[PDB]
């Protein structure tokens, strides 16, 4: 979640029915637009920011939210246009004996500005005397790895979280029938009625 992967999605048709009707995404709600209503509205740039967090702070991925991930790792802005998909991933990410590949930023001088990606792993100074990048008292490495175990509870299981953000080449689809000949039809071709 500190190095959250962002991929820009554009110049395509975005079919959201396979997302909402997948029946596998446990946490899913949408801000600024209804999830069944965004299928037939068109945006310009779509960013799919994706990361892995513990199941407790899925609530931290929300606009106007204060916490640890929402301040030092990944902050959503208050005017967030888009939405968040989080599903359980205990069967893949929590390996036997502990999974320590996933780390989160724990110590930081200031809270993050929205959509900031912080990659620096400098030894954080919490006190007055600087300690030149060596480990010690008031010298904390800011990335504390999650302890992910299959023994862990539901709140401690890893949840793969994908965050969609929206802003005109990004959209849904349609049709209806066959073409109808030699009968009075009040047709609709591309919008022309």
């Amino acid at each position, epitope marked *: 979640v500190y190095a959250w992967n962002r991929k820009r999605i554009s110049n395509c048709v975005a079919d959201y029915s396979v997302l909402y009707n997948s029946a596998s995404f446990s946490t899913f709600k949408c801000y600024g637009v209804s999830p069944t209503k965004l299928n037939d509205l068109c945006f310009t740039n779509v960013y799919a920011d994706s990361f892995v967090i513990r199941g407790d702070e899925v609530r931290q991925i929300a606009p106007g939210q204060t916490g640890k991930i929402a301040d030092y790792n990944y902050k959503l802005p208050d005017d967030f246009t888009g939405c968040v998909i989080a599903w359980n991933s205990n069967n893949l990410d929590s390996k036997v004996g502990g999974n320590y590949n996933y780390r989160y930023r*724990l*110590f930081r001088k200031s809270n993050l500005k929205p959509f900031e990606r912080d990659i620096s792993t400098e030894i954080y100074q*919490a*006190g*007055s*005397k600087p*300690c030149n990048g060596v*480990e*010690g*008292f*008031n010298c*904390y490495f800011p990335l*504390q790895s999650y302890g992910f175990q299959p023994t862990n509870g539901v709140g401690y299981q890893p949840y793969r979280v994908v965050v969609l953000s929206f802003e005109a080449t990004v959209c849904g689809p349609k049709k209806s029938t066959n073409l109808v000949k030699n009968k009075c039809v009040n047709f609709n071709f591309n919008g022309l009625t």
Partner: antibody
Amino acid sequence: MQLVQSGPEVKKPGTSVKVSCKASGFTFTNSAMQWVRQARGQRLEWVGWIVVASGNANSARRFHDRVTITSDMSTSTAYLELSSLRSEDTAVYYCALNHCSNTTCLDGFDIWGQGTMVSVS
Amino acid sequence: IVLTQSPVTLSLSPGERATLSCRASQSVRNSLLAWYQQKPGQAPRLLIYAASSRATGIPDRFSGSGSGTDFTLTISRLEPEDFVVYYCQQHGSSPPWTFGQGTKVEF
């Protein structure tokens, strides 16, 4: 701004102790508690220290394998359990905390506990 | 890294000038030799932090001076309640944030 510590535990040379130390008046930030063991009539010693936000404990060399110094941010506590509780362990155990003034932290273990007469009988 | 302190008792009169010094055997990194006092059998409390600075809430009459290995605790005005065992710190190194032997401020 006070560290309420648990009461005394009269124990046996085969048992193990469990010393807790709750922080009252505030919550644990990146505060770096240390633990000080004082045998009566001797100098203060050093057991180990927890970065409370991270949980990275680190114990002293004579205590390298038989004390685990754990912390819990949810209850705003920080624990200690010492193994095998020998006859040369009858002491008073002090949980010392570094005060963090949000914007930063201090460089001194200013707020302490009150003691825990861990008796080995 | 071990820390040796200097005279094991300060057996001299109240109400005058006394000097307390911690002669470290290895050079203290980043000058972190905080000074504590501990009246016998009760909780210690902090006087000097970062080897020179006066602590918050603590009044005057104490002074930490110097850095590195040469070091001084400067007590100005020995009241009767300052006749206490006084302690070093080395919480700067890594492990064994070694204390001192202490001393005895004695009448």
